[PDB]
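Running this now, will post back.
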Amino acid sequence: PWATAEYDYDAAEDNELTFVENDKIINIEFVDDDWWLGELEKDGSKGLFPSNYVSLGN
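Update: finished.
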C-alpha cells in the first residue's frame, strides 16, 4: 500500500527517508512493527521511517 505523511520526518541516519506532512510514501514494506520501508512518491528515494508518521491511503 501507499500512505500519506501525517507529520514531517527528518532522517537521522543514511538508511532513512526524509519527508514532510502530506507527502506520499509508496510501496510500503512492513519490515518491522515500528519501522517500515518505503519510497517517496515525489522523488523515488527509498528508506526506513517510523510507522506512526504516516496513515495508509488518502
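The CA atoms of residues 28 and 38 lie 4 Å apart. More later if anyone needs it.
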